[PDB]
Structures are given as structure tokens and as C-alpha cells.
Design a protein around this ligand. Structure first.
Ligand SMILES: *[C@](=O)([C]([N]C(=O)[C]N1C(=O)C([N]S([C])(=O)=O)=[C]N=C1C1=[C][C]=C([N])[C]=[C]1)[C]([C])[C])C(F)(F)F
Ligand code: NA
Length: 240
């Protein structure tokens, strides 16, 4: 997260750290959202490889042990069938991970609230991106969870020529683009939390930013619109 501030340790309890094993160690690669005690929602481009993954819930400081973490292995990975490996621009950037064990909910670990199917937000709706991604283009990962205020940019403006044009589809949500704050490498797959009816709901899965830079003016961070996928999500969970 670029242009962000450190989050309180109990502000966003649904946020998870998706890690893969490098050698004998583990490295953070993407964010994710706890949606069931044994299911995690993230981006398809994060689990697109035959890597060994694990999820860390109740995490705040990537390097230090906070005394609140739960490390769980990933039993199965369901990528959306229409996801095309290269194409982040084509859409369908979403996947679900069945955890090998059900995690314990407490004040540092809670389930994310999903929106009602088809829900579209008004322009400039108040949302926050969270993550341990790069704090600067070509910089390094944050050690502690960062958050940044990223209001939405509705489809009409986002798909216009001065913004993302045809690259952005209706199954995506745009947020930010002020040239100061944005998502950045390592935030991928994590949540876009939006205040709706006095309640914070996860409306997006972090997908992409400008190849030319993370905080580029008029190049908002783009997310997979969760509300466009409520039926798929429920079908996967119900079926396996
Ligand atoms: C995420 O943390 C990271 N996501 C990406 O970098 C996704 N991404 C892009 O933003 C582009 N930029 S674009 C649309 O070409 O202007 C291109 N490719 C990717 C991408 C595709 C596939 C894979 N496996 C990885 C990256 C944040 C910027 C949100 C990630 F990817 F690093 F984990
Ligand atoms: Na930690």
C-alpha cells in the first residue's frame, strides 16, 4: 500500500497473508479475505502457480511474532474457470482456498462480510485498501499492515479514455487514482473495505495497477467486483 498508514491490530480481522514456501522458509506473496472459518477468497493470479501455500490469520507484523497468529495450510484451490493466466485485463481474477483446518475466531480473526449480489457503489464511496504490499513503486514490503483511504471511481469515469478505457470491465471496481495512494505489489488478492449502511463490507479483491507505476494519477487500483461473484462463491463453497 502506497501513501498509507499503519492499521490498528484489530481494525481489519478478515485480512489474511497468503504465503508460499521458498526453500525452507515462507514468503508473503498476496493478501486475502477470510470468508468462512475454512475458506479464503483471493485473486486468481496469486495461486496460478504450482507453489506450496499457507495462510496466516491474526497477523499484524510480518516479521515479529504478535502472539495472535494462526498458521493454516491450504487444502484445495478453486480458481474461476474463466480465468486466463496472462489476462488480468480480461477479468475473472478470483479464487477460493479451502483451508486444511478451520481457524478460531476471536477479536483478531473474523469473517469478512460480502455484499448482496449485483451491488454497485456510487462514485466516490468511502473505501479502504489494506495490505503488506510495497509501500512505494519498486520499494519494499511493509512489515506491518497498512491501510489507505481509496474512494471508488465509478465504471463510467474509470472506463473513459483518460483513465483505464476498455481495460476495465463492469465486473471490476476502481478505487483511488489520486497519484498518492494505491495498492502495490504484494497487496494483490486482498480486500477493498467499503462502508455501506454503517457496516464495512468487502467489495473488491485487489487485482491490478498501472504497469508504469503503483500510484499513477488517473490509474486507480482495480479490483475484482465481489458482488458480481456471489453465486459462484456460494456454489463453490456448497459443492466442495
Ligand atoms: C499484486 O500484489 C499486484 N498485482 C499485479 O501486479 C497485477 N498485474 C498488474 O497490475 C499489471 N499491470 S497492467 C494491467 O499491465 O497495467 C500486469 N500484470 C499483473 C500480474 C499478472 C499476473 C500475475 N501473476 C502477477 C501480476 C498489485 C499491483 C495489486 C501481485 F500480483 F503482485 F501479487
Ligand atoms: Na507476526
Amino acid at each position: 500500500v502506497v501513501g498509507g498508514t499503519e492499521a490498528q491490530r484489530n481494525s481489519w480481522p478478515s485480512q489474511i497473508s497468503l504465503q508460499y514456501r521458498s526453500g525452507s522458509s515462507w514468503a508473503h506473496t498476496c493478501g486475502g479475505t477470510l470468508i468462512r472459518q475454512n475458506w479464503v477468497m483471493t485473486a486468481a493470479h496469486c495461486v496460478d502457480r504450482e507453489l506450496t501455500f499457507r495462510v496466516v490469520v491474526g497477523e499484524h507484523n510480518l516479521n515479529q511474532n504478535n502472539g495472535t497468529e494462526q498458521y493454516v495450510g491450504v487444502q484445495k484451490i478453486v480458481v474461476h474457470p474463466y480465468w486466463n493466466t496472462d489476462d488480468v485485463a480480461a477479468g475473472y481474477d478470483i479464487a477460493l482456498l479451502r483451508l486444511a483446518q478451520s481457524v478460531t475466531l476471536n477479536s483478531y480473526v473474523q469473517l469478512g462480510v460480502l455484499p448482496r449480489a449485483g451491488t454497485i457503489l456510487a462514485n466516490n464511496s468511502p473505501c479502504y485498501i489494506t495490505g503488506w504490499g510495497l509501500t512505494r513503486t519498486n520499494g519494499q514490503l511493509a512489515q506491518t499492515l497498512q491501510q489507505a483511504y481509496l474512494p471508488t471511481v465509478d465504471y463510467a469515469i474509470c472506463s473513459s479514455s483518460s483513465y483505464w478505457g476498455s481495460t476495465v470491465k463492469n465486473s471490476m471496481v476502481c478505487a483511488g487514482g489520486d497519484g498518492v495512494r494505491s495498492g502495490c505489489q504484494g497487496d494483490s488478492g486482498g480486500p477493498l473495505h467499503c462502508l455501506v449502511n454503517g457496516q464495512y463490507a468487502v467489495h473488491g479483491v485487489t487485482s491490478f495497477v498501472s504497469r508504469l507505476g503503483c500510484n499513477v494519477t488517473r490509474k486507480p487500483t482495480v479490483f475484482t467486483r465481489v458482488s458480481a461473484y456471489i453465486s459462484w462463491i456460494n456454489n463453490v463453497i456448497a459443492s466442495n
